[PDB]
Design a protein around this ligand. Sequence first.
Ligand SMILES: CC(=O)N[C@@H]1[C@@H](O)[C@H](O)[C@@H](CO)O[C@@H]1O
Length: 253
Amino acid sequence: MLDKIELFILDMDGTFYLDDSLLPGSLEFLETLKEKNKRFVFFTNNSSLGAQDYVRKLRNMGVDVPDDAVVTSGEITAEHMLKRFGRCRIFLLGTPQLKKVFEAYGHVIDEENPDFVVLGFDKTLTYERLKKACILLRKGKFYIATHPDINCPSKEGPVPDAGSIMAAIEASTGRKPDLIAGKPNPLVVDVISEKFGVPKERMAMVGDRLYTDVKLGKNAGIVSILVLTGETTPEDLERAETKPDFVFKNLGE
Ligand SMILES: CC(=O)N[C@@H]1[C@@H](O)[C@H](O)[C@@H](CO)O[C@@H]1O
């Protein structure tokens, strides 16, 4: 029951900040982890940008932080492919930033003859790119998606995300991803574990997504810490450990 934890995977929008503005207590929270000798790693299923893009956004916000401090379903999806397939020739349904991410992992984008069709939060999607992906899929190419999320919360409200695009791809090719690396797929915790050394026995998930964040911890087997700075109140199914924001979080060590 807490206090014996070493690594805290933190959510970003909805948990650490909101609407591009830090959330009260967030700053003071990290500091508390410093003192109490704790390790923290941010994570987001949003693959429309790469880790660095976020590291910038955080610092530009007022948070000095290392480069390995952020992780995305992007780098997870890449690293996992390299792990079990190696340098791959993929048709990427993603954004320029997501691409650079896959390239840094030695992968290559071959619009011509690819082995995998990879789908990310493609904010640069076009009908043609969809048409191509669908055809390649009907040629039975390995199909991988960075995350499952249907919509993504925004200033203007819920907006189409990877899941929404998937919906179309599936209605057309009748096919669904062969793999999805993002939460709640345990893979995230496993990879984060390896990359930092600390074991699942001393790791905690801190977020605001009642279903996803809680269910991640269940599948990956680690304490899930639900925070109430996001859209949370309705509850059933699985539960976890709870607190309003990081004020409470911090004070609870
Ligand atoms: C009874 C139950 O387990 N669920 C409720 C949920 O419906 C309600 O909206 C919320 C208020 O924040 O409290 C609980 O989570």
